[model samples]
Target: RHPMARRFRGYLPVVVDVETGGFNSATDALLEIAATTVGMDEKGFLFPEHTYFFRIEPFEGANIEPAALEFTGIKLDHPLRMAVQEEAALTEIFRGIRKALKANGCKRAILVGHNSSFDLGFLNAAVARTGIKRNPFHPFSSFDTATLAGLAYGQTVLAKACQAAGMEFDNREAHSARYDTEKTAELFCGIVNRWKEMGGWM
Candidate 1:
């Protein structure tokens, strides 16, 4: 029984993160993607649950910016850099999200991320490109940990916000979609828990 379970009522929080080839989702490659579920314990504390991750094969003729590749440290040419087709990847992600939404008895899922728009933008682009029709996330809304952190602790960057909240942020794993999603989920849950403790949600 997480505080958010009651506060948000029928909505489920789905934490998403994406690593792309560059800033322009329309032209850039979607390199890696991940999603994780956030729910409440019996005591109503937020906890991150099931995770889904995918390495996406760059679309034919998609652009890959060296800067973005460097930022994510994803070696596209690595012998072990296995990836599935973009359509397949998005299909799996959406399928998992829908399953989680129904399993949680939630009407819809909301995006939760550190700097959420970047992830959401990439996602919207992918959905458009793949022509995916079963996406479960809210069309235009998201829960931004950066904004929440700024409001609570005057920090906006993911790592700094985690530190300010006394939460762990592993620099070594900072850019990986899965790791970032996990940490972002932790930061989000911590903030919400604090809000509950302060009676702010009452």
Candidate 2:
């Protein structure tokens, strides 16, 4: 049999988003995760693949605010609950990211998210909880779409931010992790494209 391909022939950027139980790392749990890869050509147009979704089972001591769950519409009866523990799920997430990097031939990637600090906080907490290796791409190193949009058009609301960047926020499901992830990827690409057009790479 042929060996597995080592590198992706094009640039691939991983856009990750997570939903958490609360604001503080010590108290929060990552209830859901979603990811998508954007491929770029020399001209800088981005094409994204289908979004991937993972619903993490309740971790130890995890708690969720009643309003948050109602806003996200996540239900216990969803058939997509992840069967593994937090450690296992995080391990898989990391390994998949590395594999995706190789497949896309990316030397390094910019992690993209809206209000990314919230997502990153949960990620950092997970790494500590699992004792995973500390790498440069930890949650702290992500690209903040929320901040970028705020600068570009002075918009704070997520939907308004996308509109400011000339991007349409799709996914009527809204706060669902999978839906949000895909739209975030698209919105990021739209912003980057606009950035390039302004010749503002500096």
Candidate 3:
């Protein structure tokens, strides 16, 4: 396999987005997670691959903000939710990420997200809470599409950035972990592929 390591300095860009109970990772519940492992085509154009989503049960004594509940409509008792323990959810997702890192021959995963600090913060907080040391992602490093989008389209907000990039966004389905992650992947892929096409790198 021709590793994408050269394309990204040995880092596998994995798009990860989290939907949480509130703003503070220390106190908030990480309610949902979604990731797309970015892949390179034979022609070296980037794309999204092996997507996964996990609906998580808040950890012990995790705090939930009412506004967050209203923002995401994440009712813990909602019959439609099949929430798993947060630890298990993180373990499963981390396993997948680790597998992809080897499969792609990359040194480690560097998360890609819009407003990525919050996303990474939540993920790191969860990892800390679970005492899981096998995290595949870089501890504090990330690819912020929020920044790239500003560069590419002068839009930093996710929805606006997608729209600027000629993609569609449904307000109704907004804030959904799966939906947001997929869309973020698409946007990142589009930007990366465009840069490649313009001979920024081959």
Candidate 4:
């Protein structure tokens, strides 16, 4: 285990996930964003907290996929909805995340998620829109359950984890930003814990 892991014991690492209207980073709008910190152990296992959700204002130029919307089941009238500009939204997100980390006295955190690259794309785009020079978290990072799951089970399909891990399947409406984020976070922690127990990581 890394030395930092020992120091970080009893602290949480923030796990973030996003749902977008489309796959294109520049044009696609973020429909929803969620963050929840995981209680982690030295072996890189975690216990995820309840998710926090935010819905970003849709950009006029971006196109929303009907199928994606149908799945997430989010109406335009979500309760926590706001029309904050991308820059403002990102600024707030970063600031709140840092504040939470500082309050917890967390030295560093591994951004955990399923298919973390997609989440990172939204994060990078938000950072650019805000004109932030650098993320306060730092240059180094780690943890992605998608990669770990594939390595352990050799699965090809992404949604397989929900069933394989015995996670809930309330409806086919899976792509909603908050919904997927919650599901992914749940499955990720489960898999990580299992991996550590199996002597997968020393």
Off by over 4 Å in 1: 1-6, 172-174
**C-alpha positional error of residue 86 in candidate 4 after TM-score superposition, expressed in Å:** 3.4
For 1-202, candidate 2 gives per-residue lDDT tens digits of: 1111222223345677887766776777677877776766556555676566777775787877778777766675667654456677667666777766666555554567887777777777777877887332444567777877787788877788777767677546557677778878877777776776788542
| Model 4 lDDT tens row, 166-190 | 7774655445556666777777678
What lDDT does the true structure give each of the candidates?
A: 0.84, 0.67, 0.89, 0.64
Decoy 1 TM-score against native: 0.92
Question: Which candidate, 2 or 3, would have the higher TM-score against the true structure?
Answer: 3
- TM-scores for all candidates? 0.92, 0.77, 0.96, 0.72
Comparing candidate 1 with candidate 4, which one achieves the higher TM-score?
1
* Alpha-carbon RMSD to native, per candidate: 2.1, 5.4, 1.2, 4.2
Candidate 1: which pairs clash? 1-41, 1-44, 2-44
Query: Model 3: which ten-residue window has the lowest total lDDT?
Result: 169-178
lDDT of residue 199 for candidate 3: 87
True-structure RMSD for candidate 2 = 5.4
lDDT of 3 by residue, 1-202 (tens): 4559888888999999998989999999999999999888888888889888989998889999897778787778889889898788878888898888887888899999999989999999999999988788999999999999999999988889999999999767446788999999999999988998888884
lDDT rank order: 3, 1, 2, 4
Return the lDDT, model 1, position 177. 85
RMSD of 4: 4.2
Residue-by-residue lDDT tens digits, candidate 1, 1-202: 4344455777799999998999997899999998989877766678899888888888888899987788788877788877888789878877887777766777788999978988888898888888889778887889999999999999998888999999877667436788888888889999988987888765
Best-to-worst ranking by TM-score: 3, 1, 2, 4
